[PDB]
Design a protein around this ligand. Structure first.
Ligand SMILES: Nc1nc2c(ncn2[C@@H]2O[C@H](COP(=O)(O)OP(=O)(O)O)[C@@H](O)[C@H]2O)c(=O)[nH]1
Ligand SMILES: Nc1nc2c(ncn2[C@@H]2O[C@H](COP(=O)(O)OP(=O)(O)O)[C@@H](O)[C@H]2O)c(=O)[nH]1
Ligand SMILES: [Mg+2]
Ligand SMILES: [Mg+2]
Lengths: 257, 257
């Protein structure tokens, strides 16, 4: 119900793009949208939430571990309401943190997931079963259908690849390596439209470079914030159904042994 | 037996410091030194090896996983011989890679570990049992005594801490968080001299800033290369014994159930 005043922190050019995207939503009778942010710990999930809202609404720690309770931030602008749910990492010690996973499930009880934002770091060089277990955990808790509404977001995008490797090439290799394990973890068929998960780049840093319109751009010259909301809008408006979470859904999914 | 020509890649000021340290070693009748580089995958172990040797002697991949075979690089200068053993990460999928761990053990068979270089990234924000299992694995394979010869090295030191947090403060928090799990994994007593593990900073990047002497310095104004070799020299010259690895050692350690 609180005004999305945080938009006033974005460069004017970006604000106009975002307001236009919210317009397209209300145009399609989409008056609100719930985005669920999930992934491992320390990848910049809550920092992404602050960047999107435009204010320090959630806690971020470069040392201490995340809190256990999920948090939903809600703001409104021009009749549209954005709801974003920040959550604690799902992995710890090498296994799926069942306490964090279930507390998230309880929090989503009676809520509708319109967009799944899977977060990880761009500047990472390895991928293993740990990433696969996160994707699997998500599927087991909400159904493979959630992937039709998924977007993978890579943080720390203001990166300079080592060995003078082209930014575009590093991004390509990194994305492919991560989509592979995610697709495997979620048991998604390579041909299914659901495996076709979009990847976006994110730089939450305040030192992020900017274009002549004062917009935060990436090394590839793209204003990541407008692009992010654009992707979110397109995924939300796709023909797939949002995921309504209720006990029935949770039970029917737990039934699968 | 090959000349350490790679020293010619270091700034003159650094070369003189390093040559002086090698002199102190031969002064103490220490004609050779074997450094064992270990840690998780993708933290910059082999990149550290190239920086120390001063040439692309080992493989580095920002995507593909490390090779399975350990590699020892040997170079000589002024009668001193440096032997450095690069190894594959010990963790994978959340568990200790028993194949990589044992292949390393076979490689060290009949070798003497003078310095243990435990490698990890500076720019990481979480620490869990995974880091503890690596430290434990090391202890279980060679004995808690190896820690008397250990040094923890944090890569990506050319880092700008988020939230405008002081570099020195980030380094402090990060080191303490990592030493904690390592000390726990190795079952080291907080008062024992063995728990007093030194931490050094490393920036393998070619974009690393430099001082007026052309030396690669860190955000704290320290030439990390000379400092690194200095620490290695001091640890090697401490009163503790190096670890001679033989079947007997391996067996006696495996005996402990
Ligand atoms: N440079 C950079 N730092 C970031 C980025 N995202 C997150 N951070 C830092 O990464 C740390 C962890 O962020 P946080 O949002 O708490 O991660 P989480 O635990 O997954 O929610 C914090 O110190 C953030 O300042 C990013 O995109 N770039
Ligand atoms: N900026 C930066 N990149 C580094 C640093 N050390 C390693 N790298 C990069 O990190 C990746 C992994 O390095 P590598 O030595 O192969 O790690 P390992 O698998 O643990 O041996 C490579 O792309 C290196 O270029 C470092 O200190 N700073
Ligand atoms: Mg968080
Ligand atoms: Mg390596």
């Amino acid at each position: 119900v609180r005004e999305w005043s945080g938009i006033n922190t974005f460069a004017p050019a970006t604000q106009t793009k975002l307001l236009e995207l919210l317009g397209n939503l209300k145009q399609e009778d989409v008056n609100s949208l719930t985005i669920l942010v999930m992934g491992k710990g320390g990848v910049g999930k809550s920092s992404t939430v602050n960047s999107i809202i435009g204010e320090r609404v959630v806690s971020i720690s470069p040392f201490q571990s995340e809190g256990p309770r999920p948090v939903m931030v809600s703001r409104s602008r021009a009749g549209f309401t954005l709801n974003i749910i920040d959550t604690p990492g799902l992995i710890e010690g090498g296994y799926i943190n069942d306490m964090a996973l279930n507390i998230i499930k309880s929090f989503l009880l009676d809520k509708t997931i319109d967009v799944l934002l899977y977060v990880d770091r761009l500047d990472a060089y390895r991928v293993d079963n740990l990433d696969k277990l996160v994707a699997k955990a998500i599927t087991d808790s909400f159904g493979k259908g959630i992937w039709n509404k998924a977007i993978v977001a890579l943080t720390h995008a203001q990166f300079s690849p080592p060995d003078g490797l082209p930014y575009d090439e590093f991004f390509s290799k990194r994305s492919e390596a991560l989509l592979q394990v995610v697709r495997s973890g979620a048991s998604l068929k390579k041909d299914a439209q659901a495996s076709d998960i979009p990847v976006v780049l994110i730089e939450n840093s305040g030192r992020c470079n900017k274009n002549d319109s004062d917009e935060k751009v990436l090394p590839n010259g793209i204003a990541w914030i407008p692009h992010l909301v654009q992707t979110i809008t397109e995924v939300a408006l796709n023909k797939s159904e949002s995921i309504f979470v209720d006990k029935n859904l949770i039970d029917k999914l737990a039934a699968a042994d």
